[PDB]
């Protein structure tokens, strides 16, 4: 069927999936954040 809308929003999920806390939780996440900072991004995490 139509497959365009993969996204189907719910804030809680987003926060758990992609939030600051989650990022902090691993080394990889931390590294990601660091990279973002280096780049100079306005929103490091969600």
């Amino acid at each position: 069927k139509a497959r365009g809308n993969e996204y189907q929003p719910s804030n809680i999920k987003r926060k758990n999936k992609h939030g600051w806390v989650r990022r902090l939780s691993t080394p990889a996440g931390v590294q990601v954040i660091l990279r973002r900072m280096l780049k100079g991004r306005k929103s490091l995490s969600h």
């Binding site: 996204y7 929003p9 719910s10 804030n11 809680i12 987003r14 306005k42 929103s43 969600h46």
Partner: protein, 109 residues
């Protein structure tokens, strides 16, 4: 799906909305069956003086003369409470048994 907009209490689902708040400062605690318990001591009581017979005003007449600035450092203060010391020839060691603690502040503003 904005990352840029500031996250706030308006933004989430129900639970999220309930949780956050603005910088309100809580006035008590919450118990039993969601009965809030307003403690009187947590609420800030505004100590307003009486302004009757008070000759000061919110602006200062232009005729008042100019004078150079003097940052009120500790030394100056000491000097202006050193007469008694001089006479001798008023200090707390700790302030843990004191209401208004100067260092790790108790007093507000």
């Amino acid at each position: 799906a904005d990352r840029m907009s500031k996250w706030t209490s308006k933004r989430g689902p129900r639970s999220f909305r309930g949780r956050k708040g603005r910088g309100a400062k809580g006035i008590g605690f919450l118990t039993s069956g969601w009965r809030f318990v307003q403690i009187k001591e947590m609420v800030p009581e505004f100590v307003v003086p009486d302004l009757t017979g008070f000759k000061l005003k919110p602006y200062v007449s232009y005729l008042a003369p100019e004078s150079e600035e003097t940052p009120l450092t500790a030394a100056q203060l000491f000097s202006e409470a050193v007469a008694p010391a001089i006479e001798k020839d008023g200090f707390e060691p700790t302030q843990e048994g004191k209401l208004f603690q100067l260092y790790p502040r108790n007093f507000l503003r």
